[PDB]
């Protein structure tokens, strides 16, 4: 199949405004949220129907208990960081863990943390070590690496457990995750630029580009973002500016899910 990824996020806020949760945890398969938990509901809930239909209530009961424990642990870790940064006010602590099963069968795994939305600690499961960005992170790094068993544990989880969960979730939601809706592609003009617009496609992974007389023009092209249309499909665009003094053969190229497409502007 195509490349797929599973990743879990945590967010902790030290002094949140009234109502806003102190802790939020969301999991994703590719772009799809699958799980959610926060300090307000204190329940772990599915965020995809195919997760709700395939995981029995004892699963959500168990992970509700785990997330309540991890919520308290995250609060303690954020308290430690902010005191050691000597920081006042509200600050954020984030975590991301997960893995990719690539098309060719190889795998990747990652685990990292952020403070105030910037890299803080990054795990290297091949050297079994943490990369620290400053001296507050360095202190944490020393503590986490003194426990060699915890490093081995995370390496095993990234390389074995994460990949096995992902394969399981891929089967559950295969009607969603493994489908293909090809893009509808058009070109129009909007001093003057050609816009190549695609929409109605899934998966969101798409490559659009312009070529001039057969050569690519990377430095001259404006790339739009891949945006959700709201119905489970996506849209994207790419524009290029027209030479008013000399004609050229411009063509839009779109690659999506193994099919290549060319729109030559006449």
């Amino acid at each position: 199949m195509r490349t797929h990824s599973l990743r879990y996020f945590r967010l902790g806020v030290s002094d949140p405004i009234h109502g806003v949760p102190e802790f939020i945890s969301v999991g994703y398969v590719d772009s799809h949220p699958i799980t959610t938990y926060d300090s307000v509901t204190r329940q772990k809930e599915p965020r995809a129907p195919w997760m709700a239909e395939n995981l029995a209530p004892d699963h959500w009961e168990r992970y509700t208990q785990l997330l309540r424990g991890w919520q308290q642990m995250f609060k303690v870790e954020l308290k430690r960081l902010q005191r050691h940064y000597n920081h006042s006010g509200s600050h954020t602590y984030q975590r991301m863990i997960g893995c990719e099963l690539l098309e060719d069968g190889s795998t990747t795994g990652f685990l990292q943390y952020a403070y105030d939305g910037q890299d803080f600690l990054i795990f290297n499961k091949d050297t079994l070590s943490w990369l620290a960005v400053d001296n507050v992170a360095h202190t944490i790094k020393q503590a986490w690496e003194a426990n060699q068993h915890e490093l081995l544990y995370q390496k095993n989880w990234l390389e074995e457990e994460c990949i096995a969960w992902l394969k399981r979730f891929l089967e559950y939601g295969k009607d969603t995750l493994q489908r293909t809706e090809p893009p509808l592609v058009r070109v129009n003009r909007k001093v003057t630029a050609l816009f190549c617009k695609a929409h109605g496609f899934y998966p969101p992974e798409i490559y659009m580009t312009w070529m001039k007389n057969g050569e690519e023009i990377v430095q001259e092209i404006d790339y739009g973002d891949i945006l959700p249309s709201g119905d489970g499909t996506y849209q994207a665009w790419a524009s290029i500016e027209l030479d008013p003094q000399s004609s050229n053969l411009y063509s839009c190229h779109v690659e999506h899910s193994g099919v290549h497409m060319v729109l030559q502007v006449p």
Partner: antibody, heavy 109, light 116 residues
Framework: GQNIDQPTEMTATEGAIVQINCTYQ??????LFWYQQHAGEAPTFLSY??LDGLEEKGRFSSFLSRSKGYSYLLLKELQMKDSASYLC??????????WGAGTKLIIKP | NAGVTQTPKFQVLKTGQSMTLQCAQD?????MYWYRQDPGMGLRLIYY???????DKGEVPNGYNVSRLNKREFSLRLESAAPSQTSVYFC??????????????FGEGSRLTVLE
């Protein structure tokens, strides 16, 4: 469904070597623990393995093969004080411990 | 300090009688567990407490209830003792739960005999 097996009882001679086996069939794997429990007392932690290979720790070494679903606790130069039950426990995919029934190690002086 | 302290060490019970087993830990742990140990089988979890302020059932919760009074204490309640609850009960704690390689620290154990 989820299953761990170890021998009920083993008998070896003082000063010899004994290898206590633990096989497990589980949904997922997050580590294998060995605990020592003297008769009438509490279990105490001995070792942890989560990757393949052999870890040493004094007279005790613990081995793990994840593909075979197999571990052993190796006790060298047996002494009378090694007479105890040895419990193997595996953490499954939801981080829940599945416990073996334990192996009673009898040492002949 | 003391580690895990559970009481009583021994108890005889008549069928239908109530009983509370106490357990405290002074290691600043967050997760606490109640196990029963019976001949010929592995430890079975009765109830557990992943952190202060939350508890949930284990493998064999029927006939028991628990209370995570605070961060230190986790009591086990037998409301109506049954002969099948004759067993050795162990309370344990760990720093966290789901933090991968953390081990359990056990109390001394409580031996219960329920008689008709």
């Amino acid at each position: 469904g989820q299953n761990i097996d170890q021998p009920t009882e083993m008998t070896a001679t003082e000063g010899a070597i004994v290898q206590i086996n633990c096989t497990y069939q589980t949904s997922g794997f997050n580590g294998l623990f060995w605990y020592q429990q003297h008769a009438g007392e509490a279990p105490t932690f001995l070792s942890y393995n989560v990757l393949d290979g052999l870890e040493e720790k004094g007279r005790f070494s613990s081995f793990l093969s994840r593909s075979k679903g197999y571990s052993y606790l190796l006790l060298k130069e047996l002494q009378m004080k090694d007479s105890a039950s040895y419990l193997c426990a595996v953490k499954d995919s939801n981080y829940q411990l599945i416990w073996g029934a334990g192996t009673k190690l009898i040492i002949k002086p | 300090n003391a580690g895990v302290t559970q009481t009583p060490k021994f108890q005889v019970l008549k069928t239908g009688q109530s009983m509370t087993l106490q357990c405290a830990q002074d290691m600043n742990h967050n997760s606490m567990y109640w196990y029963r140990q019976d001949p010929g089988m592995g430890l079975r979890l009765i109830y557990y407490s992943a952190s202060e302020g939350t508890t949930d059932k284990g493998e064999v919760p029927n006939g028991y209830n628990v209370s995570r009074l605070n961060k230190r204490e986790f009591s086990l309640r037998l409301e109506s003792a049954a002969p099948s609850q004759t067993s050795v009960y162990f309370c344990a704690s760990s720093v966290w739960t789901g933090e991968g390689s953390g081990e359990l620290f056990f109390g001394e154990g409580s031996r219960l005999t329920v008689l008709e």
